[PDB]
Design a protein around this ligand. Structure first.
Ligand SMILES: CC(C)(COP(=O)(O)OP(=O)(O)OC[C@H]1O[C@@H](n2cnc3c(N)ncnc32)[C@H](O)[C@@H]1OP(=O)(O)O)[C@@H](O)C(=O)NCCC(=O)NCCS
Ligand SMILES: CC(C)(COP(=O)(O)OP(=O)(O)OC[C@H]1O[C@@H](n2cnc3c(N)ncnc32)[C@H](O)[C@@H]1OP(=O)(O)O)[C@H](O)C(=O)NCCC(=O)NCCS
Ligand SMILES: CCCNCCCNCCCNCC
Lengths: 168, 170
């Protein structure tokens, strides 16, 4: 299997995997990304995010001939204490293709991206009950900032943003 | 005091760092701030800005004892969630002591909301410490919800030493 950055033609496989991940996260119905959106936002242009894909050789392709069986979606963020961070938005490997070392390779490529772009850390979210992934990351030196430093992710949706924008 | 909210320019980096430190100092973390003016300059004003920043400026008569015209700020950037949409991410939000309670913060949140509407953002995301109840309510009063607890999400990090190990492994 080889890990490489995506191509505009990797778009349909990417959407497919994003949906498999959403499903895994019970978020499938809320997926709002389209191939059109992916092509515009992910490509070369002013690119909003970046994707990596893992593809296996013929002998292990999917019943549907898909060779792309994994992916990672990321972007850069900023921390006032240490600066530029690499933020991992999505990371997924098809069920039958896990434990092969594929995910490890993606994390390796992501680390090099991080070193090359001078990022001081990599941040990402993990579901409370996702034991397998919680360990996979911890085995590679990750710490749970929500436990250690008590951070909780908060959100203010559009209707309230609109209220504040117009309140004046 | 009278104040104006505006975008930070290359010219304002020493004040950005200064306020970052005041925020850190306000949280007894000032020594942790490794960031330099050089970084803020290269990272925020080159071709691809990695953060955006609105600052609050005051007239010469209300300068800080050290003679400074910026008393608050907000650092942010845009992120994306495939099952949410494009997002405005508020990294830091802070106003100096002798300048709070005068509408500075409200104004900043108002302009950030307009920026969000301009960029077609589905929502604004930010972190709050679990024990900071006053802050938690300030945001809840504005329609915020604790996504970490409601949906079961935990923030993780892998620091540089481990990223370097994996980047160079074997
Ligand atoms: C997290 C995820 C992306 C990782 O990818 P992956 O391809 O399974 O990862 P790997 O194959 O490198 O590692 C699998 C494991 O088996 C072991 N392993 C991997 N390759 C091995 C090999 N060649 N020989 C022996 N053991 C191996 C690894 O040590 C690891 O075990 P450990 O967790 O006890 O350390 C993923 O398993 C999957 O997509 N699952 C769920 C969705 C999810 O939780 N996504 C992530 C983010 S919140
Ligand atoms: C939140 C922060 C940016 C506010 O900006 P600000 O310029 O003082 O605020 P505004 O004058 O525009 O008034 C904002 C309002 O914030 C609160 N506020 C005003 N002055 C305040 C002060 N001196 N101390 C604490 N809260 C204050 C008011 O209660 C009101 O909040 P409410 O609408 O929920 O009732 C602020 O002082 C700061 O820099 N914050 C960090 C932490 C903190 O004390 N947090 C908590 C929440 S109330
Ligand atoms: C209101 C409905 C839900 N809104 C959002 C869920 C929030 N955080 C999502 C995910 C990211 N990263 C995976 C590794």
């Amino acid at each position: 299997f080889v890990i490489r950055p995506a191509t505009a033609a990797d778009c349909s496989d990417i959407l497919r995997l994003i949906k498999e991940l959403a499903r895994y996260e019970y978020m499938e119905e809320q997926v709002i990304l389209t191939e059109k959106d992916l092509l515009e936002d992910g490509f070369g242009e002013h690119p909003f995010y970046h994707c990596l894909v893992a593809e296996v050789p013929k002998e292990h392709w999917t019943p549907e001939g898909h060779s792309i069986v994994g992916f990672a979606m990321y972007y850069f963020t900023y921390d006032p204490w240490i600066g530029k961070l690499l933020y991992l938005e999505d990371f997924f490997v098809m069920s039958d293709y896990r434990g092969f070392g594929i995910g490890s390779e993606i994390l390796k490529n992501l680390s090099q991206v991080a070193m090359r772009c001078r990022c001081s850390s990599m941040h990402f979210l993990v579901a409370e009950w996702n034991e397998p992934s919680i360990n996979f990351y911890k085995r590679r030196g990750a710490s749970d900032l929500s436990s250690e430093e008590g951070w909780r992710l908060f959100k203010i949706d559009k209707e309230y943003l609109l209220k504040m924008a117009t309140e004046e």
